[PDB]
């Protein structure tokens, strides 16, 4: 509770547009654009000023535009006086983080940033090792917005991938004013047998209305029918469903739509690090 990992998404259950089928999941564009489910990636590269036994040494200096392993161009554009980047300088592709220079037996071997990675420098520490050799650790952060393909999953083994990011405008709204954050296909419930997720939706609705956090501890939590019987006196259909209006055309759907607040967790499976191609 002091260090959580996820957010309460007000989820609606229906297949819209047919982009949430086969475990797929549809996401409110606006919510994303306002913060919801955003996260930052972190990766620290290191560079140890190795001292070869032969007497030679590395020395982190801006690789002089010469020969031997030289990358050429302004791949070293970001480097400073010492050949180390300064914070908040956009990193990308094979950009040089620290300019190395290893002697014969002089090459480059300068540590460059990973392929399908980019972003901005955050901290550039510098210190020594037990060997007494100057060590440089540079960490790079990468802003990561929940884009198409990222993995999302509730605490009920209900894993899914963002199938389409639909504008809040096209997003359907409940007479009470609620707009779904994540829309899960109704075909991923009766097949599996996960009642706890539905109960959790209702519990999150009650929790949102009442103000109580609700106890869902195993064996000793409110029997579902009590949260169902309380939810109404709070002012909502017992059934977890409400009246929803189609944001596209406009007539309200001739049915009730189960809307709840279930706690979704963003997994570390970001499409940004999955996609790659071979030339």
């Amino acid at each position: 509770e002091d260090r959580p990992a996820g957010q309460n998404f007000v989820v609606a259950v229906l297949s819209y547009h047919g982009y949430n089928m086969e475990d797929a999941v549809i996401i409110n564009k606006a919510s994303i654009e306002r913060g919801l489910a955003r996260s930052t990636f972190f990766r620290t590269y290191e560079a140890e000023e190795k001292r070869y036994l032969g007497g030679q040494k590395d020395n982190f200096e801006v690789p002089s535009p010469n020969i031997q392993g030289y990358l050429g161009e302004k791949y070293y554009r970001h480097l400073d006086e010492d050949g180390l980047i300064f914070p908040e300088s956009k990193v990308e592709g094979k950009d040089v983080l620290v300019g190395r220079t290893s002697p014969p037996r002089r090459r480059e071997t300068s540590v460059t940033v990973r392929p399908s990675e980019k972003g901005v420098v955050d901290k550039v520490i510098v210190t020594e090792t037990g060997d007494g050799t100057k060590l440089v650790k540079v960490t790079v952060r990468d802003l990561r917005i929940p884009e198409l393909g990222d993995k999302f999953a509730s605490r009920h083994g209900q894993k899914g991938v963002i199938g389409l990011i639909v504008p809040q405008e096209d997003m359907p709204w409940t007479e009470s004013g609620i707009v779904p954050d994540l829309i899960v296909n109704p075909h991923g419930i009766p097949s599996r047998m996960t009642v706890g997720q539905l109960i959790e939706a209702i519990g999150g609705k009650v929790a949102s209305l009442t103000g109580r956090r609700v106890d869902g501890t195993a064996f000793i939590g409110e029997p579902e029918e009590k949260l169902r019987k309380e939810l109404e006196e709070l002012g909502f259909k017992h059934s977890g469903r409400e009246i929803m209006y189609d944001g596209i055309t406009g007539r309200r759907l001739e049915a009730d739509i189960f809307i709840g607040v279930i706690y979704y967790q963003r997994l570390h499976h970001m499409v940004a690090d999955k996609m790659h191609a071979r030339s």
């Binding site: 982009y19 393909g149 389409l164 191609a277 030339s279």
Partner: protein
Amino acid sequence: TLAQRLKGFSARTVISPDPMISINEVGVPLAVAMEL
């Protein structure tokens, strides 16, 4: 020795649905299209 000698363009990513494209069509991210 001898008896011990003879002895001893693509891409990958996540998938998303699309009932708005032809059944034989495939959605390829334009970045992947610019590499391949």
